[PDB]
Design a binder for this molecule. Structure first.
Ligand SMILES: Cc1cc2nc3c(=O)[nH]c(=O)nc-3n(C[C@H](O)[C@H](O)[C@H](O)COP(=O)(O)O)c2cc1C
Length: 338
């Protein structure tokens, strides 16, 4: 039994850095079509990242990015069942503002909203607007995030905070209304510090899938996350990020993957710096027939600590359709759906 989410393309061209990949801008209407089709095929959740600066090149890769809370507020208004997660770049928003935005999208969605809390680590995204705290941030960022989430938990739990720390001073800070359901916090910590944060404050932790057609290769990461969760006694499972490149046959899927690699936008790859390829930021990739991808996702579901997968596709509109019509019906870990 495994949850499935869609990582919505809030940035241009999704997760392929290639002149041979589909070229598209992130629009509301594209993300609306993607999330409504994901909801139709019983995807459990939709998440958007936040990406405040791109990598340029021929494809202007991630030069064009919408903002995560406003995108997800719009998507909440045109959905009814799928869970909706926005990402907070915690250097860019005061916690009381995130608290109130989360209560707002709770109201829009009827209790289907959560927040992905990130420290940020790419200095230029912050330096460009004069808000990088300096190179001490690399080591202290989970101290900062710990204070941030304490403020969030106070406001969502009681409506008020008197929290006083190194980074925040709350003087009877108020945020009402409080969310109608317990607010879900998710984290994407890979480091020991990040997983220790997730074990204390997250409902679940996102990690990277690893390799091409080695679906269980992330297992050591999920094991580290289970060990971190033992230290708090909390049930904090792993949701694993993969790109799915599926077709009618293994050969046809491999032909598309190779076509994408052949178009690699090397100027964009420069800025960013059977093996994984920089063409999708060395993402965990599942490349095969619909049946091969279903088998490989059933293998993810068997890894200790894995509770779900977060999916990108080479083509989201056709990828979600073929996932729902051809892959998901063969998955033992989705036999619970209608
Ligand atoms: C699925 C996923 C989504 C992520 N989304 C973002 C994002 O939107 N913005 C961001 O600054 N970092 C993002 N990250 C980076 C993580 O928050 C984190 O910094 C990274 O996994 C490194 O781990 P560490 O922070 O413990 O070193 C993401 C990571 C993963 C696995």
């Amino acid at each position: 039994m495994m949850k499935i989410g869609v990582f919505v393309p809030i940035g241009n061209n999704g997760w392929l850095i290639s002149t041979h990949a589909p070229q598209y801008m992130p629009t509301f209407e594209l993300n609306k079509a993607i999330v409504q089709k994901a909801e139709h095929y019983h995807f459990d959740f939709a998440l958007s990242m936040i990406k405040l600066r791109g990598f340029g090149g021929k494809t202007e890769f991630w030069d064009h990015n919408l903002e995560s809370f406003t995108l997800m507020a719009g998507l909440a208004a045109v959905t009814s069942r799928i869970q909706i997660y926005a990402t907070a770049a915690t250097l860019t928003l005061p916690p009381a503002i995130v608290a109130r935005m989360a209560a707002t999208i709770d109201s829009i969605s009827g209790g289907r909203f959560g927040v992905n809390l990130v420290t940020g680590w790419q200095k230029p995204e912050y330096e460009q607007m004069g808000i990088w705290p300096g190179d001490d941030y690399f080591s202290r960022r989970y101290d900062y995030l710990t204070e941030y989430v304490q403020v969030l938990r106070d406001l969502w739990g009681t409506g008020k905070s008197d929290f006083k720390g190194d980074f925040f001073t709350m003087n009877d800070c108020r945020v009402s209304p409080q969310p109608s359901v317990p607010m879900k916090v998710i984290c994407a910590g890979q480091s020991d510090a990040g997983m220790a944060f997730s074990a204390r404050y997250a409902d679940f932790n996102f990690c990277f899938g690893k390799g091409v057609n080695t679906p269980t290769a992330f297992a050591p990461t999920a094991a580290r996350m289970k060990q971190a969760a033992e230290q708090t006694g909390r049930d904090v499972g792993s949701y694993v990020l993969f790109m799915v490149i599926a077709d009618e046959t293994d050969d046809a899927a491999r032909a598309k993957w190779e076509h994408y690699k052949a178009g690699a936008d090397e100027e964009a790859l420069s800025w960013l710096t059977d093996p994984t390829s920089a063409v999708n930021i060395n993402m965990g990739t599942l490349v095969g027939s619909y049946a091969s991808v279903a088998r490989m996702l059933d293998e993810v579901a068997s890894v200790p600590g894995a509770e779900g997968v977060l999916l990108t596709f080479d083509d989201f509109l056709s990828g979600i359709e073929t996932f729902g019509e051809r892959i998901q019906p063969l998955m033992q870990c989705r036999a619970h759906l209608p």
